[PDB]
Design a protein around this motif. Sequence first.
Motif, PDB file in Angstrom:
ATOM      1  N   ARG A  90      -3.178   9.635  14.268  1.00 43.59           N
ATOM      2  CA  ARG A  90      -2.328  10.653  13.675  1.00 43.59           C
ATOM      3  C   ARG A  90      -1.520  11.357  14.746  1.00 43.59           C
TER       4      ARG A  90
ATOM      5  N   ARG B 229      -3.797   4.314   8.193  1.00 41.07           N
ATOM      6  CA  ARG B 229      -4.161   4.592   9.576  1.00 41.07           C
ATOM      7  C   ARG B 229      -4.503   3.317  10.343  1.00 41.07           C
TER       8      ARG B 229
ATOM      9  N   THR C 126       0.246  14.272  14.673  1.00 45.64           N
ATOM     10  CA  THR C 126       0.479  15.594  14.113  1.00 45.64           C
ATOM     11  C   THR C 126       1.766  16.215  14.618  1.00 45.64           C
TER      12      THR C 126
ATOM     13  N   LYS D 147      -0.922   2.258  10.823  1.00 47.96           N
ATOM     14  CA  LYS D 147      -0.022   3.181  11.510  1.00 47.96           C
ATOM     15  C   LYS D 147      -0.554   3.584  12.874  1.00 47.96           C
TER      16      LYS D 147
ATOM     17  N   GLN E  29       0.825  -1.192   0.000  1.00 48.87           N
ATOM     18  CA  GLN E  29       0.000   0.000   0.000  1.00 48.87           C
ATOM     19  C   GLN E  29       0.869   1.256   0.000  1.00 48.87           C
ATOM     20  N   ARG E  30       0.223   2.375  -0.260  1.00 49.62           N
ATOM     21  CA  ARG E  30       0.910   3.635  -0.103  1.00 49.62           C
ATOM     22  C   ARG E  30       1.022   3.968   1.375  1.00 49.62           C
ATOM     23  N   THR E  31       2.104   4.661   1.720  1.00 47.89           N
ATOM     24  CA  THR E  31       2.324   5.113   3.084  1.00 47.89           C
ATOM     25  C   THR E  31       2.441   6.621   3.203  1.00 47.89           C
ATOM     26  N   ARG E  32       2.704   7.320   2.095  1.00 42.45           N
ATOM     27  CA  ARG E  32       2.631   8.774   2.047  1.00 42.45           C
ATOM     28  C   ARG E  32       1.356   9.294   2.674  1.00 42.45           C
ATOM     29  N   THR E  33       0.238   8.621   2.442  1.00 41.16           N
ATOM     30  CA  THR E  33      -1.011   9.295   2.750  1.00 41.16           C
ATOM     31  C   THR E  33      -2.182   8.358   2.979  1.00 41.16           C
ATOM     32  N   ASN E  34      -1.994   7.319   3.790  1.00 33.16           N
ATOM     33  CA  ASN E  34      -3.102   6.672   4.482  1.00 33.16           C
ATOM     34  C   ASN E  34      -2.502   5.801   5.559  1.00 33.16           C
TER      35      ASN E  34
END
Lengths: 127, 63, 23, 206, 97, 60, 17, 83
Positions: free
Chosen positions: B51, B45, B53, B48, B38-43
């Motif tokens: 969030r 959750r 921040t 991971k 999968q992509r990890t740049r931008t999902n």
Amino acid sequence: EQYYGTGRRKEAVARVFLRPGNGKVTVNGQDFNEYFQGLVRAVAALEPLRAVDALGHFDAYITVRGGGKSGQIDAIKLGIARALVQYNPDYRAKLKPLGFLTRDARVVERKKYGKHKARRAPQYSKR
Amino acid sequence: WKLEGELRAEVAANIKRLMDIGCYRGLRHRRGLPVRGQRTRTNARTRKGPRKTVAGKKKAPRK
Amino acid sequence: GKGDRRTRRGKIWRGTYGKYRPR
Amino acid sequence: GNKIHPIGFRLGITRDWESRWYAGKKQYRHLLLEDQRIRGLLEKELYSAGLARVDIERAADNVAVTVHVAKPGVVIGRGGERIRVLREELAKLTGKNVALNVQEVQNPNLSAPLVAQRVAEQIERRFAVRRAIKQAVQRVMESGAKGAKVIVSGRIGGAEQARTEWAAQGRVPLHTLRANIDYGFALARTTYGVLGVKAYIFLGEV
Amino acid sequence: IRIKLRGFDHKTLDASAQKIVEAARRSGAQVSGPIPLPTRVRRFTVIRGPFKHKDSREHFELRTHNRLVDIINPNRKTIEQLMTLDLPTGVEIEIKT
Amino acid sequence: ARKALIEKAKRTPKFKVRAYTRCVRCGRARSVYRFFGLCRICLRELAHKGQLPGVRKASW
Amino acid sequence: SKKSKPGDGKFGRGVKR
Amino acid sequence: PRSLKKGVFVDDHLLEKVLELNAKGEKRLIKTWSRRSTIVPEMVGHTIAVYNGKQHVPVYITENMVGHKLGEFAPTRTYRGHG
RNA sequence: CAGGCCUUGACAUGCUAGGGAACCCGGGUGAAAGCCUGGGGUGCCCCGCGAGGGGAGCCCUAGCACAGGUGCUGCAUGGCCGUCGUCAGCUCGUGCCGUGAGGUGUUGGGUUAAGUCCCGCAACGAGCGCAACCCCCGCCGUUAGUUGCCAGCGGUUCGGCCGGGCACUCUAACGGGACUGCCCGCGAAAGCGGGAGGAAGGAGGGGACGACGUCUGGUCAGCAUGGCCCUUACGGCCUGGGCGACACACGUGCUACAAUGCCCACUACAAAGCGAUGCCACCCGGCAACGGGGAGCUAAUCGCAAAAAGGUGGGCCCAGUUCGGAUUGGGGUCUGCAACCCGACCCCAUGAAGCCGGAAUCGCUAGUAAUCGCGGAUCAGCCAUGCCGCGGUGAAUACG
Ligand SMILES: [Mg+2]
Ligand SMILES: [Mg+2]
Ligand SMILES: [Mg+2]
Ligand SMILES: [Mg+2]
Ligand SMILES: [Mg+2]
Ligand SMILES: [Mg+2]
Ligand SMILES: [Mg+2]
Ligand SMILES: [Mg+2]
Ligand SMILES: [Mg+2]
Ligand SMILES: [Mg+2]
Ligand SMILES: [Mg+2]
Ligand SMILES: [Mg+2]
Ligand SMILES: [Mg+2]
Ligand SMILES: [Mg+2]
Ligand SMILES: [Mg+2]
Ligand SMILES: [Mg+2]
Ligand SMILES: [Mg+2]
Ligand SMILES: [Mg+2]
Ligand SMILES: [Mg+2]
Ligand SMILES: [Mg+2]
Ligand SMILES: [Mg+2]
Ligand SMILES: [Mg+2]
Ligand SMILES: [Mg+2]
Ligand SMILES: [Mg+2]
Ligand SMILES: [Mg+2]
Ligand SMILES: [Mg+2]
Ligand SMILES: [Mg+2]
Ligand SMILES: [Mg+2]
Ligand SMILES: [Mg+2]
Ligand SMILES: [Mg+2]
Ligand SMILES: [Mg+2]
Ligand SMILES: [Mg+2]
Ligand SMILES: [Mg+2]
Ligand SMILES: [Mg+2]
Ligand SMILES: [Mg+2]
Ligand SMILES: [Mg+2]
Ligand SMILES: [Mg+2]
Ligand SMILES: [Mg+2]
Ligand SMILES: [Mg+2]
Ligand SMILES: [Mg+2]
Ligand SMILES: [Mg+2]
Ligand SMILES: [Mg+2]
Ligand SMILES: [Mg+2]
Ligand SMILES: [Mg+2]
Ligand SMILES: [Mg+2]
Ligand SMILES: [Mg+2]
Ligand SMILES: [Mg+2]
Ligand SMILES: [Mg+2]
Ligand SMILES: [Zn+2]
């Protein structure tokens, strides 16, 4: 013998053959109340012959291709209104006050480049 | 079939195996990242977590 | 729902067949 | 930048294609290359004749190229011999029996593609751009046209700041489809870049 | 004895459908008038600009039209006549039995 | 990395998976139609020119 | 001092290759 | 995963470099570019230098690294976190 | 990007010197590229019972002229596009006003979707725009009648299947039709309100079409191009890696949080397109992806193809659930030289967040919004939930 009419609403084309009898109606070899079982807008196709009390006077043999069952209903309601007046032209009045002689020319507007649909436009956000 | 407790044990033994030999899926399991490309740049959750921040690159002022 | 490959609904979405939507 | 190609806009109405044939999906493209390669040679070799429209007809395993040249004396050459050495040069690309007509030019001052090249050469030859545009548009209207528009864009006079210059006479209704607008483009190289030259001739309606 | 014609412009197709029918209507008899089969259309949607302006496209179609015509009675005066006729460049021909 | 790749597309390659369309007019490696052998730009250029048999700005 | 963006510290030139 | 009807995949050029060692008494430190090769039960006990795009990572093979490709054991991006 | 490699070079023109070729099958090394290689055997016009030696498609070795550069400058450029804006506007010629920049016309009353049109006037006309001619849709006609259709009789294995027929439906080409034409009412007129006929009425619905110009807007990486720059390398070939990274932030979307729903079985109704190393009927193996066999179609004929929402029947009973389907384990399939990074799909298992979303904010005025499925380009396969189309069902509201 027969008094015919062609019907059209929205890609749906229907062919109507008004014949005298009790009231038996038939679409594509299947019976009427069969074919449109459950579709509560069924009685709508027959409304022309109630504006001239022709209900139990006639029978109807019909064919349909194109569109969907509802578009076929508005088609049948047209062709039968046309078959009726092409049985006698005095029926024209009392059938025109009820839009029966006219064709519902509303159609699926085409999708335009730059959109999601015909007019639904993609979502905006200044920044 | 093998079930509740033993099924977990076999799952846990498989995952353990991948990490011990040091393969890619094993390294994804240490850092706890997605395993199936999968992509990890931008999902990610689910994989991971909440969030965390952090601060960003400060926009230059005017004047 | 359509995300569920394991039903007739999910298969129509992904446009495939199997145990759950045969042809 | 906005406006649509005046010719592309009237195909099927005022304007005919420059290639006429049918071909199935399995080799429409192969033909298309030959065609483009064909006009490659002719617009290359027959520029000096003043070329205006290469019409390529096809039936099967043969071809009929029709060249629309301003001075057909250069095309046919010293006694059917130039037109021959090329009708022979075309076989070396075509392979098929390359049948090559030469068609006369009505009035060169009514060929938008010609006007363009005449102006582009004048700006290639260091003449006043604005003047050359007013002159070109005069010669067209005198040749009995119903309107004319010529547009130069680039480093006019070598000016560092690029500029648009144009001139228009008669009437040019680019929104009217029954209008017959010959459109042409010429490119003009110089020591300081390139300039585009668009020429619009309005030949009357239908 | 059947012919099917194909072209990217009807007005050429419709023209040589006629001038075929009549030629065997010259050396008759039975000629089955030209049917208009459905038009098969191939489109191309294209980003109008050379770069980056994605919501601006221009359309293009390529229509192959289709006419079929039947001659029921050969008459070798037309299985001769037809071979030499006037079929312009925009059309293709197939002949059947 | 242009001319060497206009050539290398023509070559027949170690495996057939390495074969890609390129525009025969300009050489673009993207948005190429197999029907014409043209990219979407060239397509639109030769179209408006009339040099494209039976091609015509659709509208409906 | 070579190709394309970002710059390698010489006018015009970048870092690639 | 590859159709087991087809062949379990090794590049052939790397597998011969192995079998010879097995024969004339292994083992040299074998380097290759076939990340796509499958770890084959012959390979166990050798160390294979697999290119990561940049260097040849020494990989010692063991009975339980068998199912996999050699590329699974030489990662290609160096990360070590933000911060 | 790392590494291994080539240096008139992957490609174009032209000049030399040698082999004297051409081209097609090998071999050693090496990840490949490359380096080293091994074979056979060419016309062409020729003096030929002769040894033969020239010349010429085109190859190769060296050697030049040159090629190559997706290196820079979109603030040097062409071309093409975005955009204000389908907004109603921008101007010119002559005359007139002003020392002049400029004004007048284009302002003004009325009207229109509109610088649309009417009246008025130191102006009178003209051009670019608006509208119109083009296209799709809605009624009717002519022309056609197979691969499409089946009204009424004849057969009929009960399928328009066969006789037959082209009425009808359709297909696809050429016409007709709406004009504020007619009636009333207002008005100087333009028009505006209403009515009748009529499939359609005030531009019938939709498209294509974009004014002089703006933003030193975008693009030297589609292409073109001036100038600057590189020359055994900023060029070229290769294998591998990366473009798929992930403390994080934003945009556009997909799927949901459920009962107006979810699930299983059975059963209906589209349109537009694609298809001869393609679409794949149908038969069998497989829970399945798929595989093997295997007809038909150059395709209104054969195939993709089942449309889905619907309708009928049963099941669930308000639960983080038979709601939701992420994440992970295992086992397979296909494409492809090859799916580790980094493919789609199938089946067993797993079964996260999510109980309708803070401040904020988007779209749409009708066959529209919403909802439902289907196709195509690209393409071996596919990360398409994208994009360009297609029809099914079908609202709410507009005081102002
Ligand atoms: Mg239609
Ligand atoms: Mg819709
Ligand atoms: Mg935006
Ligand atoms: Mg990733
Ligand atoms: Mg300060
Ligand atoms: Mg100089
Ligand atoms: Mg978009
Ligand atoms: Mg490819
Ligand atoms: Mg391509
Ligand atoms: Mg950077
Ligand atoms: Mg600019
Ligand atoms: Mg520009
Ligand atoms: Mg920039
Ligand atoms: Mg203004
Ligand atoms: Mg004046
Ligand atoms: Mg004065
Ligand atoms: Mg003035
Ligand atoms: Mg006035
Ligand atoms: Mg004004
Ligand atoms: Mg003004
Ligand atoms: Mg003024
Ligand atoms: Mg004023
Ligand atoms: Mg308007
Ligand atoms: Mg008829
Ligand atoms: Mg207009
Ligand atoms: Mg700028
Ligand atoms: Mg460039
Ligand atoms: Mg440049
Ligand atoms: Mg390189
Ligand atoms: Mg590579
Ligand atoms: Mg990307
Ligand atoms: Mg967020
Ligand atoms: Mg999405
Ligand atoms: Mg399909
Ligand atoms: Mg749960
Ligand atoms: Mg919870
Ligand atoms: Mg559940
Ligand atoms: Mg479920
Ligand atoms: Mg798995
Ligand atoms: Mg992969
Ligand atoms: Mg609940
Ligand atoms: Mg909400
Ligand atoms: Mg929300
Ligand atoms: Mg609106
Ligand atoms: Mg839904
Ligand atoms: Mg799709
Ligand atoms: Mg695809
Ligand atoms: Mg993915
Ligand atoms: Zn191109």
